[PDB]
Write a protein that binds this ligand. Structure first.
Ligand SMILES: O=c1ccn([C@H]2C[C@H](O)[C@@H](COP(=O)(O)NP(=O)(O)OP(=O)(O)O)O2)c(=O)[nH]1
Ligand SMILES: [Cl-]
Ligand SMILES: [Cl-]
Ligand SMILES: [Cl-]
Ligand SMILES: [Cl-]
Ligand SMILES: [Mg+2]
Ligand SMILES: [Mg+2]
Ligand code: NA
Ligand code: NA
Length: 326
DNA sequence: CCGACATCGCATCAGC
DNA sequence: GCTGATGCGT
DNA sequence: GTCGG
């Protein structure tokens, strides 16, 4: 919050490049800059000072000076006035509508919430559900509620099969006092990198959660990744809780640490840590950490018996989940 | 310069 | 039906 | 948009 104004500006620009410009690298660049400035323990006094930080170059340093001087940025002042950009930026806020679909809908004349509602038949299932819960998905989740949700998910999963292990990751695991959604990592002894001794492992869980009316909708569902909606139960006469987004990822039990590291995030942290691994000669995904050969081909998975092991391979001192929020 | 920039599951599509 | 690309969220 | 070689 020391440099709240600057990081907001950059995030706004980041979203602009992603949604409107469809320039993924400019989007990631801006986010990186916002991130590194967000952890900077001093109130930025000038662009130069910010340029010293990695991820901050000349262009941003300059924007930063313009912003500190005027309290705003002309480039965005205009972006804000452009009807098309405003429309696209908005449509992309619906879960399931991306830069492409967004620009597409605008051409077809669909540019407002009202339009989406009246043209529901022009949306795929995911988008349909995204619009349905457009308001609720805008709401944050208090940790208190996350704890309530955790209890349910963990207790219902135990009911299905005592050998299931569900860990809540994402921002929750990093200690956030509020989260955008609930992310669940799931493991079962039967499902390993070696073999899948039992089918429907993920299905059985989603089924049990829908059975107790916890899961309300499904954005997408596969063999190992479920993407949907849930809602805490309310008491008598009690106003209902907002509908919450929920992601469930089933990972081979023997690849838990690479899996939990990944799902704990943050996304930017994963980005910087994976980028760092490549520079060290390794490649990391949610299943393993493999070395990179002379050709660039990833080799066999290196043994991993803890999150710290992964950090060691890349010569990075361990960092608790609470300190990976970049 | 200029090439890289993290990684991949699920939905949807085009072509054969 | 299959595969490969693309979108999207990850 | 920024970075490294
Ligand atoms: O682009 C992505 C998105 C997510 N992730 C990982 C890290 C992230 O913490 C985790 C869960 O994704 P969410 O989008 O749910 N983010 P998170 O839980 O960190 O924060 P929020 O409270 O917004 O959900 O998945 C990536 O690696 N890359
Ligand atoms: Cl780009
Ligand atoms: Cl501004
Ligand atoms: Cl592992
Ligand atoms: Cl792998
Ligand atoms: Mg999350
Ligand atoms: Mg999530
Ligand atoms: Na810099
Ligand atoms: Na969207």
């Amino acid at each position: 919050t020391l440099n709240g104004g600057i990081t907001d500006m950059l995030t706004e620009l980041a979203n602009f490049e992603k949604n409107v410009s469809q320039a993924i690298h400019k989007y990631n660049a801006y986010r990186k800059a916002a991130s590194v400035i967000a952890k900077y323990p001093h109130k930025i006094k000038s662009g130069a000072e910010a340029k010293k930080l990695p991820g901050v170059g000349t262009k941003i340093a300059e924007k930063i000076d313009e912003f500190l001087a005027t309290g705003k940025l002309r480039k965005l002042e205009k972006i804000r006035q452009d009807d098309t950009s405003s429309s696209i930026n908005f449509l992309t806020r619906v879960s399931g509508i991306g830069p492409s679909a967004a620009r597409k809908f605008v051409d077809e004349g669909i540019k407002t919430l009202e339009d989406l509602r009246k043209n529901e038949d022009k949306l795929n299932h995911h988008q349909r559900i995204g619009l349905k819960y457009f308001g609720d998905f805008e709401k944050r989740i208090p940790r208190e509620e996350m704890l309530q949700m955790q209890d349910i998910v963990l207790n219902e999963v135990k009911k299905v099969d005592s050998e299931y292990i569900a860990t809540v990751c994402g921002s929750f695991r990093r200690g956030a006092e509020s989260s955008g959604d609930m992310d669940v990592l799931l493991t079962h002894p039967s499902f390993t990198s070696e073999s899948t001794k039992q089918p429907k492992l993920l299905h059985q869980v989603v089924e049990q959660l829908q059975k107790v009316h916890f899961i309300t909708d499904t954005l997408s569902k596969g063999e190992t990744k479920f993407m949907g909606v849930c809602q805490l139960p309310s008491k008598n006469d009690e106003k209902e809780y907002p509908h919450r987004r929920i992601d469930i990822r089933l990972i081979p039990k023997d690849q838990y640490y690479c899996g939990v590291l990944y799902f704990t995030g943050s996304d930017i942290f994963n980005k910087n840590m994976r980028a760092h691994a490549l520079e060290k000669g390794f490649t990391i995904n949610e299943y393993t950490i493999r070395p990179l050969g002379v050709t660039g081909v990833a080799g066999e998975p290196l043994p991993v018996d803890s999150e710290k092991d992964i950090f060691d391979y890349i010569q990075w001192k361990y960092r608790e989940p609470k300190d990976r929020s970049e």
